[PDB]
Structures are given as structure tokens and as C-alpha cells.
Amino acid sequence: SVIAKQMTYKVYMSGTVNGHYFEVEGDGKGKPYEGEQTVKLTVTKGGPLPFAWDILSPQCSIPFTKYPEDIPDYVKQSFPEGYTWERIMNFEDGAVCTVSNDSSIQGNCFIYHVKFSGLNFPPNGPVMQKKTQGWEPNTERLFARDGMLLGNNFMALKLEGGGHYLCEFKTTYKAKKPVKMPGYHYVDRKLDVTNHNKDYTSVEQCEISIARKPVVA
Amino acid sequence: SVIAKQMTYKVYMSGTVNGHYFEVEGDGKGKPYEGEQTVKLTVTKGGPLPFAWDILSPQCSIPFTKYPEDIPDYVKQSFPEGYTWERIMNFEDGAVCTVSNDSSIQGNCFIYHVKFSGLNFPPNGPVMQKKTQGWEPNTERLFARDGMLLGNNFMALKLEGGGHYLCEFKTTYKAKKPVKMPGYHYVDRKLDVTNHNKDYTSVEQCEISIARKPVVA
Ligand SMILES: [Br-]
Ligand SMILES: [Cl-]
Ligand SMILES: [Cl-]
């Protein structure tokens, strides 16, 4: 296969949050068939970021999803041609982000180019005041439509002091060639910041992603 | 406990869909601690319904949810005082439903009073043209806030011909007394129409609901 049991990846992300421009570069690695992966990011421009790092962590790698053999793996099949993805994040306090990615492969390394646009975060909310403490483990609902893989996820950020800050994700994955489409299924993830420097200009993330059928069916 | 291992329930539902008034009555039974239940519904007024039965099936019983001992069971704890619930269903073609319930107990029988308001279903859409073929097995994201249990679910109806028709649920459960609040968790459900007459004026449904912690955590 063009996707080896061990792979690396590079992340090039740029964008704005409430008008604040930034750039990030990442170097990641993982086991695509085990759904295990890690990434080390550096804020290369606009740092230190005046907003919660957590809104950016889910934008830094779908080939690293363990798919059981009886569920077609849309993203792994798209290679070597690759795929793109388009995400809408609707936060419960009215903030909205639109994120686009282009994913390609160069030997044993995936290349992700990401554009992030976030705005309408309340200036005294938990994202601009950096009161978030990571995403809860989550489940993306996935199904096939018009040759694209459509995902939806009721996400939630944990807050300093308790409580949750809700965010709805809508992600559409678009393979650059036709592939075998999967049935209606889910992907469970855990995403954690495992290390960071004082001002989050260097961050390390670990993510485990596993596809499955419904538990009760 | 006030909730026995085998219980019955009665449903009294009324409402409108694109201005069409109806009433439904149901007789149900199940094993609350096993998350198993079945209900028989009869359209008592405004039948045959000119819209898909499927939009009404999730309005006909949260006490019948299997909760592990280490996850507080918000709804079972609310009894004998009981609880209410409020639901918003946003369909992808712009249709919206608001549903309210009052749930009480009389001995070994729960009593559900439901009010349904649905509108903006396109006249040539799958609900008004009766092209739906049941709900996909699904997962409700649940968490506690201000003494209420908040649920969200990315639901989908199967369509005649193979597609899906998406619906977002937001359900708020409100106990009539304070109860021990659970942590962030999920409920998996399968909901099926197991029998019906030609015009869906008599319908039988089976539902299995099981609470759990995230699969990947
Ligand atoms: Br670091
Ligand atoms: Cl398709
Ligand atoms: Cl609470």
C-alpha cells in the first residue's frame, strides 16, 4: 500500500481569530492502521496567541484512523491522489470558524495545508480569555453522500472552574478520486495536549481515532 | 424502588404538522433497568396522517434506559415526582419541530403527555411524501448543566431509494426535584417500527437504549 504501517506528516496552518493573524508548523507521526498519532506544533507567526490553543488542536489528520476491515476507509483509499476537507465549527456563544485543508502524500510523509478563519468569539468568553481545558472524548457521525464523506460531531471543551463550552462540528471530506463509499458509521476520538511551553508557542498533541459500527443496532 | 423491573406506560400525544392536527394514544411496556421497551400506538384523531410516521416515533420514554451503576441515572432518580422534556428537531431541509412532554408515575405505569408542533416541511419533501424508512441507530451526547440534563443527537432517517435525511435533536430533560447529576456520557439507541397497518393508524415500536462512557478515552 502507499500508506505504510508507520508514517510522518507535516502541518502548515495559517489563519485569523477575531482578526489576529497566525501561522503554525507541525511535525507528526503515527501508525495509520492503529489510529494512533502524535504531533508537535510551533507557532511560527503571531505568537503568543491571544486565544485558546484548543480551537486549533482538531485542525492539526484523518489517515490515522483505525478502520475495521468491514468498513471502507474513505480517506486511506483516496491516496496517493489525496483529499481535502471543509469544516464549520459553531460555538454555543455565537462564535463561528471555517477551516479548509488540502492533504497530500510525499513518500512516507503526509502534507496538510490548513486555512483557519475564526470570529465572533466574545472578548470576555473562554476562548479569548484562555479558560478552556481540552476537548471531551468525542464521536463523529459519518455517512456517504454524492461521493463525499459527511461528518458531524457534538464537541465540548472542558472549562476552568467546571462546566462545558459546546461546539458543533460539520466536516466534509472530499477524495480527489472516486473510492468505495462506507455505510453509516462512527469514529470515536480522544484528543489531548500532552505537553506545551508556558505561552503555548510549542504544543504536543496525542490523538486516538477508531471507526466502528453503532454499539446498539 | 418506585421503578419496578417490569413497568407499563401510557402515551397521550397531540399536535400539528404543517397545520394538520392529530392525536395519538399509546400503551407501552418494558424493563427499565435493561433499557428495553415496546409501544403500540393508535392514531385517534386526524388519521390517516398525511406525513411520515417516523417524525413521531421518538416522541412515544427515557426511564427505559439501561444505566451502569457508576453513571447517575437522571430520569430514574426524578421519580416519583417525575420530569418534563423539551425537544427541538432541526431537519436539513429547513423543517423544525418543537416537542414537549410531561412524565409522571401511577403505580407500575408511567404517564406521558406530549405536545408536538412541526412545520416548514417542504410539500414535496420526504416527510410530506412519506419516503422515510426509519431512524438509523444513534447516540445522544449527554451532560449536566444548571440541574438539567442536556442531550444532542445527530439523527438520520433512511430514505426510499438509499439516501439519508438528516435531523439534529436537542433535548432538555428537567427533573421535578434535584437529583445527583451525571458526568459527560452517551446513550446509544436503536428505534424500529416492528409492525404497522397500511396507513400507519396502528404502529408498534421497539427501542433499546443503553448509557455508557466514551468508547475511546
Ligand atoms: Br511542547
Ligand atoms: Cl455516495
Ligand atoms: Cl447541574
Numbering used by the authors:
A (entry chain C), B (entry chain A): 2 to 61, 65 to 221
Publication excerpt:
GfasPurple and amilCP have the same chromophore composition (Gln62-Tyr63-Gly64), while the chromophore is composed of Met62-Tyr63-Gly64 in eforRed and Lys66-Tyr67-Gly68 in spisPink. The glutamyl moieties in amilCP and gfasPurple are sandwiched between two glutamine residues (Gln38 and Gln209), and this is also the case for the methionyl moiety in eforRed (Gln38 and Gln211). Similar water channels are present in gfasPurple and amilCP, stretching between the chromophore-interacting Met159 residues. In these two proteins, the water molecules also hydrogen-bond to four tyrosine residues (Tyr188 and Tyr190), as well as the protein backbone, aiding the stability of the remaining imperfectly packed hydrophobic residues within the interface. The same hydrophobic residue from each chain is at the very centre; the Phe158 residues in gfasPurple and amilCP form π–π interactions with each other, while the two Ala190 and Ile162 residues in eforRed and spisPink, respectively, form hydrophobic interactions.
Anthozoan chromoproteins are highly pigmented, diversely coloured and readily produced in recombinant expression systems. Here, high-resolution X-ray crystal structures of four open-source chromoproteins, gfasPurple, amilCP, spisPink and eforRed, are presented. Like GFP, chromoprotein monomers have a β-barrel structure that contains a chromophore, which is autocatalytically constructed from adjacent X–tyrosine–glycine residues encoded within the protein sequence itself.
